[PDB]
């Protein structure tokens, strides 16, 4: 069956490229929303707000 899929065509490289683009875009969305400022800030122990 692998040989039949090999001589049938090469669509799964395209499929994996699309899915890898989707995954990289998911990580880029997460960096776009949450990362923002690179510097991490500690909780302000002085709590008189």
């Amino acid at each position: 069956c692998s040989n039949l899929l090999l001589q049938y065509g090469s669509f799964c490289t395209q499929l994996n490229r699309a899915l890898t683009g989707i995954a990289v875009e998911q990580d880029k969305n997460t960096q776009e929303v949450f990362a923002q400022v690179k510097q991490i800030y500690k909780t302000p122990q002085i709590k008189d707000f």
């Binding site: 990580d27 990362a35 690179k38 991490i40």
Partner: protein, 50 residues
């Protein structure tokens, strides 16, 4: 947390991400020649720096 990483020397220094592995861990090809006497250019895994 993602799984089992074999072939990368885990370092518990915190560098910025080079190759996103997953589960907050990144890999990078770093120069160990200047680090440990006469060592070899090698792949290191670590926890990515936020």
């Amino acid at each position: 947390r993602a799984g089992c990483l074999i072939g990368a020397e885990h370092v518990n220094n915190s560098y910025e991400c080079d190759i996103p592995i997953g589960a907050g861990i990144c890999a990078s090809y770093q120069t160990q020649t200047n680090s440990r006497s006469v060592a070899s250019q090698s792949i290191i895994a670590y926890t990515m720096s936020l």
